């Protein structure tokens, strides 16, 4: 069974370099050229170049080519990617991918800014009036100032998935924000617990908010 | 470089239906191209190869095919799962990747469940006030939200994020956030959330009283 691991996000200010790494396993590393792939929101996909583990020979895409570098260490079945004078335009999730495209890493998450990782603070969104006797209820949580992404969001431990929009952060100076929503019968809240369960890994720190009523 | 371009770049089809996209390299391939579908929150997905191959596992409603320069792929018995954007791959060896088509399932129009939420007393201890609106469940993707503090319009603070199409009701949702200082969530009191979308000529509003 092939298997490509890369290594984790990467947090790099500007103007640094940052150097991903791939391991394969579960066939002969030296004998298929390893490629590596640019995913962005603003660039699609974008090759960014190959090398042969055999002999070392590396071929770029030249958008590239002046500041990546294809490595490997042979006798470790690795492949490296080497990428200097970073911009926020480089900020990707970056893919080694085994010739034919067939077998990709699980991709590395790269994250060109000068910001500090932060925690999130996060706040309950409950509605300023009380529901209808019998109508439909929507909840949420407002998950403001953290970094760098991602964070995850869920719903009593996952227990509650219906009507759950978790939308896109967005930049709100050097931080992120986002909310997630909910929707739940009046008849469930508040009369049960609704906990929105906010998980940012690189900050170490999972928060649980309780969701009640205003007044 | 060679160029493999893509087409069409956007796709809207319905339910069991059946799409079509076009590759076309600016020279002769030698039938070295491949599909690939990304979804979000997920690594690029080879569903065939070397022009009409499938993957393992991949179905049959999945088909390519072409010869020379000029190359197709098809998806038949559309599912709302399908939902994503397909990209055509050289990959002889210098590797050329198509721009991508986006896949949009169609369906009924839908007018958004609007929600408006006062900044939380958590949130106003810290000296902040966001006010939050959700627009959520609506078809099509086009839709307008206006922020009115007071009665007043209100652009400055917005913060807006829209959703990719969900993968099992085909609808879109949207987040709108007005943060202020809390210092001027306090001298006004009536804040609006204007929802307008193509389902009616009419807005969808909803607003609270600062002081309940
Ligand atoms: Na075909």
């Known amino acids: 069974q092939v298997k490509l691991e890369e290594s984790g996000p990467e947090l790099v200010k500007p103007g640094a370099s940052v150097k991903i790494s791939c391991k394969a396993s579960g066939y002969s590393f030296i004998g298929y050229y390893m490629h590596w792939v640019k995913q962005s929101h603003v660039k699609s996909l974008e090759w960014i170049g190959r090398?042969?583990?055999?002999?070392?020979?590396?071929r770029y895409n030249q958008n590239f080519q002046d500041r990546a570098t294809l490595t490997v260490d042979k006798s470790s079945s690795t492949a490296y990617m080497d990428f200097h004078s970073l911009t926020s335009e480089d900020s990707a999730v970056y893919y080694c991918?085994?010739?034919?495209?067939?077998?990709w890493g699980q991709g590395t998450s790269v994250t060109v800014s000068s910001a500090k990782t932060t925690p999130p603070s996060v706040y309950p969104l409950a509605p300023g009036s009380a529901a209808q006797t019998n109508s439909m209820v929507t909840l949420g949580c407002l998950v403001k100032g953290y970094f760098p992404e991602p964070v995850t969001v869920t719903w009593n431990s996952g227990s509650l998935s219906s009507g759950v929009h978790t939308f896109p952060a967005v930049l709100q100076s050097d931080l992120y924000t986002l909310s997630s929503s909910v929707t739940v019968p009046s008849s469930t809240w508040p009369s049960e617990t609704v906990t929105c369960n906010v998980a940012h890994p690189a900050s170490s720190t999972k928060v649980d908010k309780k969701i009640v009523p205003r007044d | 470089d060679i160029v493999m371009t893509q087409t069409p770049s956007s796709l809207s089809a319905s339910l069991g239906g059946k799409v079509t996209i076009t590759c076309k390299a600016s020279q002769k391939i030698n039938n070295y191209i491949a599909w690939y579908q990304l979804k979000p929150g997920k690594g690029p997905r080879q569903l065939i190869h070397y022009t009409s191959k499938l993957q393992p596992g991949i179905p049959s409603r999945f088909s390519g095919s072409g010869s020379g320069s000029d190359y197709s792929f098809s998806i038949s018995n559309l599912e709302p799962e399908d939902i994503g954007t397909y990209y055509c791959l050289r990959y002889e060896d210098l590797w050329t990747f198509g721009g991508g088509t986006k896949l949009e399932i169609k369906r009924a129009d839908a007018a958004p469940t609007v929600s408006i939420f006062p900044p939380s007393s958590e949130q106003l201890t810290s000296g902040g006030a966001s006010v939050v609106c959700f627009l959520n469940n609506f078809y099509p993707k086009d839709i307008n939200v206006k922020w009115k503090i007071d009665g007043s319009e209100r652009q400055n603070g917005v913060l807006n994020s829209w959703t990719d199409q969900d993968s099992k009701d085909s609808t879109y949702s949207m987040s709108s956030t007005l943060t202020l200082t809390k210092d001027e969530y306090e001298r006004h009191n009536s804040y609006t959330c204007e929802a307008t979308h193509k389902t009616s000529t009419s807005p969808i509003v909803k607003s609270f009283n600062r002081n309940e």
């Open positions: 991918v085994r010739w034919p495209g067939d077998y």
């Open positions: 090398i042969n583990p055999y002999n070392g020979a590396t």
